[PDB]
Design a protein around this ligand. Structure first.
Ligand code: HEM
Ligand SMILES: *[C@@H]1O[C@H](CO)[C@@H](O[C@@H]2O[C@H](CO)[C@@H](O)[C@H](O)[C@H]2NC(C)=O)[C@H](O)[C@H]1NC(C)=O
Ligand SMILES: *[C@@H]1O[C@H](CO)[C@@H](O[C@@H]2O[C@H](CO)[C@@H](O)[C@H](O)[C@H]2NC(C)=O)[C@H](O)[C@H]1NC(C)=O
Ligand SMILES: *[C@@H]1O[C@H](CO)[C@@H](O)[C@H](O)[C@H]1NC(C)=O
Ligand SMILES: *[C@H]1O[C@H](CO)[C@@H](O)[C@H](O)[C@@H]1O
Ligand SMILES: *[C@H]1O[C@H](CO)[C@@H](O)[C@H](O)[C@@H]1O
Ligand SMILES: *[C@H]1O[C@H](CO)[C@@H](O)[C@H](O)[C@@H]1O
Ligand SMILES: *[C@H]1O[C@H](CO)[C@@H](O)[C@H](O)[C@@H]1O
Ligand SMILES: *[C@H]1O[C@H](CO)[C@@H](O)[C@H](O)[C@@H]1O
Ligand SMILES: *[C@H]1O[C@H](CO)[C@@H](O)[C@H](O)[C@@H]1O
Ligand SMILES: *[C@H]1O[C@H](CO)[C@@H](O)[C@H](O)[C@@H]1O
Ligand SMILES: *[C@H]1O[C@H](CO)[C@@H](O)[C@H](O)[C@@H]1O
Ligand SMILES: [Mn+2]
Length: 299
């Protein structure tokens, strides 16, 4: 928001306006990174980003401590090298390369289509980076009619997404990725769980309207009563939530579910790519931005 508006006060006293990305700007398959870039907390064009810029943007404007993004940082730079062919040092070339399939970017996302989702030819691939309203809708349907949801509901959502992707993706493409996806499940509870509730730290409930605003608009739900969590969330909360989701009892099992989908998952670890392996081509679609309605500077 405009600095003088005082919208983020007293949680964020140094805000910047929202500015929609242009045809030449670089965006990622991450709703958190895109929101930061749209506000200029990280380069608005999504290029040449240092670890320290990432750390400060997250901590100061999203209430996310350094421990939370430690592994994400490592994996971002590992992928940069794999895609560009050379070490990226401390300057992430761009956000777009983060959408390199079967790496950090994984199948069965909550709001993006898979790289080879519903393609007639093996050589075809599609936009697995930009926000897809229809895909997000398949996530929202699971909790239709509710205002909040818990760990059990989230487990149902990720199960529905895995079933759909396993069925729609070109034969042989689908690859389950529970460790990374559920850290992201934890990210969601860390950022948009309802801190107004008495036992938010032990039994966090996600506010659906906050979640919708963030994902769809790629900006912050201040107009809805949201504010960065204070104190800043630490990695402890995220991995615990991740674990609680996969441990939640399932009351509805979808069909065509990949083997071992139900049950605990392994902890996320840094990625590694064989030097013999060539990267997949990146989708070249222009950056997505909210159009119904378009956002103003304070949205
Ligand atoms: C520098 C740190 C980060 C990097 C490099 C990063 C990278 C990525 C990438 C590559 C994806 C995978 C896309 C997919 O296949 O679903 C993604 C997804 C996502 N990220 Fe981030 N991210 C970071 C931090 C965060 C944080 C701290 C949050 C929020 C508190 C966040 C929330 C999400 C969510 C919820 C998704 C999943 C969207 C979906 O499945 O539709 N990210 N991020
Ligand atoms: C995306 O952001 C816009 C702007 O903040 C949201 O539109 C506001 O929504 C509430 C409830 O629908 C209205 O009372 C406001 O007056 C709306 N403002 C405008 C300019 O229309 C929109 O709801 C957000 N989208 C999602 C999915 O959360
Ligand atoms: C982000 O960086 C990647 C890696 O440099 C860019 O992708 C390459 O772009 C060149 C020129 O368009 C192509 O010859 C390569 O084949 C691309 N690599 C891959 C793996 O697809 C990408 O264009 C950059 N994107 C943005 C928006 O800046
Ligand atoms: C925002 O400003 C108020 C008053 O100056 C102060 O008490 C508060 O701690 C500030 N918030 C942050 C995150 O610095
Ligand atoms: C989230 O974190 C838990 C605990 O590390 C994992 O078991 C899960 O697979 C996901 O990575
Ligand atoms: C979640 O899990 C991680 C590792 O899996 C722990 O470091 C953290 O304390 C929390 O228990
Ligand atoms: C780990 O931490 C989360 C969030 O604080 C709890 O909900 C979970 O019960 C476990 O204690
Ligand atoms: C990982 O952590 C969560 C929260 O402590 C547990 O509920 C789960 O059973 C697993 O041990
Ligand atoms: C785990 O437990 C739930 C209730 O908590 C059952 O309804 C479900 O079928 C599963 O066995
Ligand atoms: C059993 O309960 C879960 C949440 O606890 C629902 O998401 C599911 O649809 C079923 O009714
Ligand atoms: C029960 O609910 C789950 C999640 O909503 C579905 O995927 C399943 O098909 C059944 O209808
Ligand atoms: C649907 O079916 C699976 C596997 O049979 C169960 O684990 C789940 O609890 C639900 O009843
Ligand atoms: Mn994906």
């Amino acid at each position: 928001q405009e600095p003088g508006s005082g919208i983020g006060y007293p949680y964020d006293n140094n805000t910047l306006p929202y500015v929609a990305p242009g045809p030449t700007d670089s965006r990622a398959p991450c709703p958190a990174l895109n929101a930061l870039a749209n506000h200029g907390y990280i380069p608005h064009d999504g290029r040449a980003i240092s670890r320290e810029t990432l750390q400060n943007a997250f901590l100061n404007h999203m209430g996310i401590a350094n421990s939370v993004i430690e592994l994400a940082l490592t994996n971002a730079f590992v992928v940069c090298e794999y895609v560009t062919g050379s070490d990226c040092g401390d300057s992430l070339v761009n956000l777009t390369l983060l959408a390199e399939p079967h790496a950090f970017e994984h199948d069965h996302s909550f709001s993006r289509k898979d790289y080879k989702q519903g393609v007639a030819n093996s050589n075809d691939f599609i936009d697995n980076r930009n926000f897809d309203a229809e895909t997000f809708q398949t996530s929202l349907d699971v909790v239709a009619g509710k205002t909040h949801f818990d760990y059990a509901d989230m487990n149902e959502i990720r199960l529905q997404r895995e079933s759909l992707s396993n069925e729609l993706d070109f034969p042989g493409w689908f690859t389950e990725s529970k460790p990374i996806q559920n850290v992201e499940s934890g990210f969601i509870f860390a950022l948009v769980s309802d801190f107004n509730l008495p036992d938010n730290d032990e039994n966090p409930l996600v506010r659906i309207d906050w979640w919708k605003y963030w994902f769809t608009n790629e900006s912050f739900p201040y107009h809805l009563g949201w504010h960065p969590p204070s104190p800043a969330r630490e990695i402890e909360f995220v991995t615990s939530a991740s674990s609680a989701v996969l441990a939640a009892s399932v009351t509805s099992t979808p069909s065509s579910l990949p083997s071992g989908a139900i049950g605990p998952g392994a902890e996320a670890v840094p990625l590694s790519f064989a030097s013999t392996m060539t990267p997949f081509l990146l989708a070249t679609n222009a950056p997505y931005y909210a159009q119904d309605p378009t956002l103003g500077p304070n949205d």
